[PDB]
Amino acid sequence: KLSEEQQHIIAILLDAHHKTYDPTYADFRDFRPPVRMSPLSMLPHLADLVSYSIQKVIGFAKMIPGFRDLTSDDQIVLLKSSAIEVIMLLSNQSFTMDDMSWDCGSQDYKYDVTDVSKAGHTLELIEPLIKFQVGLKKLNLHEEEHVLLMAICIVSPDRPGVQDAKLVEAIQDRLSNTLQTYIRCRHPPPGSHQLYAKMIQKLADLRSLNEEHSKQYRSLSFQPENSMKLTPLVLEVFGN
């Protein structure tokens, strides 16, 4: 019941993922070094991590079937708004339920609540972010469902500033139907129970996290000396 096109779409998204996500995290050594102590000591390191991840999110989006057909301005709008959400999704791969932290290959590059707090964020974001990572982890998505969820997150028509919303929605619909059919044919029970609905709920959760993140980003970036620690791409994307 999974058509040839839908098996094609999945193969593409999986490939795009493999070419844009490095599970060895080798490049992290290029970042400004993580400093754990106290005042914003993790901002330069995590800011570089984010900036790096935006580049990977961009590379992924471009390989989403139909994404290229959008106008450059719609592409910009979709990436600007979803980037932090897709990074949070991407990060679930490094997130371990063992100690509720993001474990990226080593101890220096192991990130926990106190590391995120030392990036300038409060529990008002961090609590639901971990809550999100745990609940997403519990879903035990196939990698196919993971990459589909990320594509669907990027191509949302209700994003602020979207012009050709009809065209965006058509692209997303084709992806949603690909996901829904995949779960029915490829994801066995009980793991497939209400799985689509739960995955959609996660997209709602990400909107909320995106909103809280923006508020706290405006606070942090409001101060030039902290804004000074970010990267040009992070300012361009998370900025106005």
Binding site: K62, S72, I76, L79, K80, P232, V237
Partner: peptide, 11 residues
């Protein structure tokens, strides 16, 4: 709209 680097990475 005024996103040089984002648009450059998109092309």
């Amino acid at each position: 709209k005024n996103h040089p680097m984002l648009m450059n990475l998109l092309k």
